[PDB]
User: Fold this.
Amino acid sequence: KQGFPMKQGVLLPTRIKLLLTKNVSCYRPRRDGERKRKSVRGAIVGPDLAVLALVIVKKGEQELEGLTDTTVPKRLGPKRANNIRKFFGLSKEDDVRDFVIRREVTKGEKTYT
Amino acid sequence: ARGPKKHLKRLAAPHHWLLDKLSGCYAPRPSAGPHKLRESLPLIVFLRNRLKYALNGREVKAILMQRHVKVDGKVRTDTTYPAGFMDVITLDATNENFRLVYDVKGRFAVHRITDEEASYKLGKVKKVQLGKKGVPYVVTHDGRTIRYPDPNIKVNDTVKIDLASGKITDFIKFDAGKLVYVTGGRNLGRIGTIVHKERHDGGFDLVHIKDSLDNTFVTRLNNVFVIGEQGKPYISLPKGKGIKLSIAEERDRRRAQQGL
Amino acid sequence: GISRDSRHKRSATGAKRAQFRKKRKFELGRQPANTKIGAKRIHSVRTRGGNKKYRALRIETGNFSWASEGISKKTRIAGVVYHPSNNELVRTNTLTKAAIVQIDATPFRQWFEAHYGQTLGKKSKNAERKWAARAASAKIESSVESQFSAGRLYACISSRPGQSGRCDGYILEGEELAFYLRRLTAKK
Amino acid sequence: STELTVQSERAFQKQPHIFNNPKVKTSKRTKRWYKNAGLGFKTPKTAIEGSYIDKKCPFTGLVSIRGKILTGTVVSTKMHRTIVIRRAYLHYIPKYNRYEKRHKNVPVHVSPAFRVQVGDIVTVGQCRPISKTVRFNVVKVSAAAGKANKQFAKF
RNA sequence: UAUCUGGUUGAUCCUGCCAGUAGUCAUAUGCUUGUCUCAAAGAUUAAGCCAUGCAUGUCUAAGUAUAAGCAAUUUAUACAGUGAAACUGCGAAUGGCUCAUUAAAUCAGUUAUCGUUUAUUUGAUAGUUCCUUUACUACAUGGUAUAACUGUGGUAAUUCUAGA
RNA sequence: AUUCAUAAUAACUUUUCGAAUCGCAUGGCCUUGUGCUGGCGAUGGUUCAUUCAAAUUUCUGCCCUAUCAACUUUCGAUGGUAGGAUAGUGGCCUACCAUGGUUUCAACGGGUAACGGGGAAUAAGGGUUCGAUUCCGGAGAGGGAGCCUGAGAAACGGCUACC
RNA sequence: UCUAAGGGUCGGGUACGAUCAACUU
Assistant:
C-alpha cells in the first residue's frame, strides 16, 4: 500500500528511504551518476502489503484458467548467428541465412514480410 | 568558467576579421586546429566576408559539404576550421588556389596563386626533438610533425613541404641576409632581409630587419618567419610587397593614382 | 573536502583571510590508506584526466634493487613502525617511501651463488668459465655479508605505494647502511 | 658552515640517483652533482667542493632559475637556509609629479654555498615555489664591507 | 569655447561663506507632445528575488531497428526506403542572469611552468600478444545479460516503478 | 640552464594498448575456388606534438579610518628535514626540529551606501567624481556543507543532508 | 603496552666512547 516496491536484502520491513544508484533495482537514473533517495519496502512479507508476486516452480495437480491453460509465445527470435546456431543445433557451417525465422505481416490484401 | 568557452562575441574577435560590434552579437569561434585562435582565419570568414561568394553561414555550409574546398590538399568541411598563415586553400570552381598571406596593414591578404605554387607550402620549425625509438622530429607552426629530417634543420629555420606527402624538399636557415615575413606584432606584414640578431639569454631574442626602402625596424624572433634570400622569395608575394607606405604616401597615391 | 589550497591559511603578515571561494576540485585532497604488510589489496582511485592512481592497502611483496651488482629481485617484506608524519589523514603503523624494511634475501642468495659460485656467511665447464671470468668481485661488504647470515636484508622503499601501488626499493649499502639504525622511533 | 657535519637530520641526506659504488675503488671518494645554473652565474667552489646537500640549491639541487632576477639587501639571517631581503624603490604619484619611497620584503632561500650577512647586497632568481612565501633563490653575493674588520681594531 | 554676478556697511576696501549660473549615455517626478532614424529599460529599495506559468537535447550512405508503424523497394528470402521508441555515443561544465560576499584578495599589465592536467581538433605514431609461444583455440572472426517490445500489477499522486 | 629528450641494463604490474567495428564502390590475377588480392572513407585507439583551455605563479599597482599600534604562533604563525596527499609546486597536510615572519615606507583591525578593469561625466592645463552594464575575468544560483558522473563541475534548469 | 625528553663518574696518540642511577613531564 502506497505503492512502494520490495527490495532484496532490506530487512526491517518498513518504508525506509535509501540511496539508489544504477545497476540496481527500483530506480532508473535520468543522468549519468545520478543517485537518489527513495522509499523502499523491505523484503519481509507482512499485512501491510497489497500485491505479492509469485513464480510457479513446481506445477501441482490442477490447471488454471489463465496460467496453465494458455501458452503465450516468445515474440523475437535470435538475431545473432551463433545463437541461432545453438537454437537449431546445426553447430558448424550450416548457412543461418535460411534457418532464421520469418514473420509474415498483413499490411493489407497484398502482404509482404 | 568550468570548462572551455565554445562561444565568441563580436567585439572579442580579432580586429583583422572586420565585422561589427555593438550588440551585433556573436562571431565565429575558430575550432581547435593547427593555428591559434587569434592568428587564424576561419573559412566562414574567408568565404562570406572576403570573397563574397556567400552571404550566410548556411550557404557556406552548403559549399563546404560538397568537397569543393580543401585546405592543404584536404577537404575540411568544418565551418570554423582555423586556416592560418601560409595555408593553401583550393577551390575547383575557377581552379582558384588561394594562399592566405598578410597585407601590410595586418589583415589576411587573399593571394591568388598558381597550381605549381599551391603544390607546396612553408613551415617554421618551432622545436626539434627525438621521439620514441630515437626518431628525430620537427614541429612546424602549423602543428605538422615530420620525422627523420635533415640533421642540419635547427630551430627557427623554415622548411618547404610538398603538401601531398608531408615531406621536406628543401630548408632555409636563419641567418643574416635572409628574407623575412613578419607574423604577429605591430610590424605585421613587412618584408625586410634580416640585418642582425640580438640574443638576450632568457629574454626574448630580438631581430633587426631592413626593408627595401632601408626602413630599419626591430621585431621579436617568435614573430619572425623566413621565406628566402635577398630578392628571391619562395612565394608569390602580394600587392604591396611589405613596404608600409606611410599615410602621406598613401593619400598621394590615391589622389594622383586615379581620378575615378 | 580537504582543500589543498592556501586561501584558507593566513597571510604571511598574520592576516586572517576571508573565506573567498567555495571549495574547488582543482584544490582537491584525498584520504590516505595506511599501506600495511600482508594480503595485497589495491584500490584504484580516479584522478584528474582519468589517470588511475593505485592506492595500495596491505602489500606483501616488493621489488628490490641490488645496485653494486646491478640487479632487481622480487622479495617479501617485513616489519615496520612508521610514520613520523601524520595525525589526521593516515593512521596505523604504515609502510611508505623512505622507510627501512627487512626483506627475504633468498633470491639474492640464490643469484649470488649461481652468478659467482660463492656462498655467503659461515661444476660444469660453462659455469666454471663464467665464475672464473667474473670473479674478483664477490667481495661486497662485511655488513651485507653479515645480514645474509640472518637471511634478512635492510632495504629502503623508493616507491610511493599510495600513488603507484608497489613496494619497490633498493638494498642499503655503504654510508647509508652505516648511518641508519639509530632512528625509527615512530607511530602514525 | 651550517655544521650539519653533514647529516644532522634523522633521514640520510644524499643527492638522488647519485650512486657511489663501494665496489669500484675510485681514487676520489667524492662523487657530487653540480650544474651551471645559467645566465652567467658562476658556480662556486664551495658548492663543487662542499659536502652539503640542499635540494633547494640552484647548483647542486633540483630547482631551476627561470623568470626574474632581482637584487636586494639582507635585513635578516635568522632562519635556516633562507633570508629576507629588502627591495627598495620609488613610486610615482602623477597628481604631485613626484615620488615616494617604498619597500617590499622578499624571502629568499640561500644555499650554504654562500656566507651571507646582514647588509650584504645579494642577487636572486625566481625558482619554483619552495615554501609558503619563498619563490626566489640566492645566486650571487656582493659584500659591502671590503672585509673591514681591522677598522674596529683601534688602539 | 582660460568669463563669473547678488547678499554683511550710513558708505569703502577685504577675508569669507550663502545664493545664483552651465553640464551630466544621473536618476526621479510634474506639465506638454505632430513626424523620421537610433534606442537603454526591477541595478539602487528586498542576492526578498521573480516565488504565478511556460523551456536543451541530438543522427548521418556510414554503432544497434522483426515497431505486431508507414509506405512501397518490385535491385533482393537475412536486413538492406523512411522511421517513433529504446540501448549506445557525444553534449548538457557553453550560453544567459546577477552583483551578495570580496580591500594585496579579485583585477590590470607583465612573467613562468626546467612545477602540472588537457576531451576535442590537427599532424605523426604499434609486424614483436597463440602464455607449454607443434593442437592450446573461433580467427572465414567466439560469450552473457538487458533495454525498448509483449503481458500481469501496485499506489491519490511524481519524468515512481515491481514481478514474468 | 637540468637527474632534459632519447636509448640501454635488471626486474616489476592487481597488467594498460597493440580494431572480433561500420558504409559505398566493386575492380585486378590465375592453380575457376562464392579462391587470392584490392580502392575511397567513417568511427575507435597507445604515445608524442599542436590547438582550444585549465590550474598554480613573478613584479608593480587600489578607497576612507590612529576615537585601530602593535599583530601572527591557540588545535600552522615563519622556515628546515622527511613523509603523505595532489594533476602537479608548496605547511596543502600532518611527525620531529628551530623560532621565526609583518609593522609609522601604516602592519593588524574597522568601515565601504566597495566586484575589479576596459571605460563614463565634467574639465585651458593640472585634476575631481562615477564605473550594478552591451567587451574582458572573479564569484554566486535561498543559506551553508558534501559528492556522483565526466576531459572538464565542488554543477545547482545535477544528487545528498541540515537550516 | 610503548615513545620522547630531562643526569652522575671515568677516557682522551699533543668529533665522541665506557659505566652507573633517579624521579618528573
User: Anything to note?
Assistant: The beta strands of chain C are 2-3, 28-29, 41-47, 50-57, 61-66, 71-76, 100-103, 153-157, 169-171. Chains C and A do not touch (no CB pair under 8 Å). The CA atoms of residues 44 and 50 of chain C lie 11 Å apart.
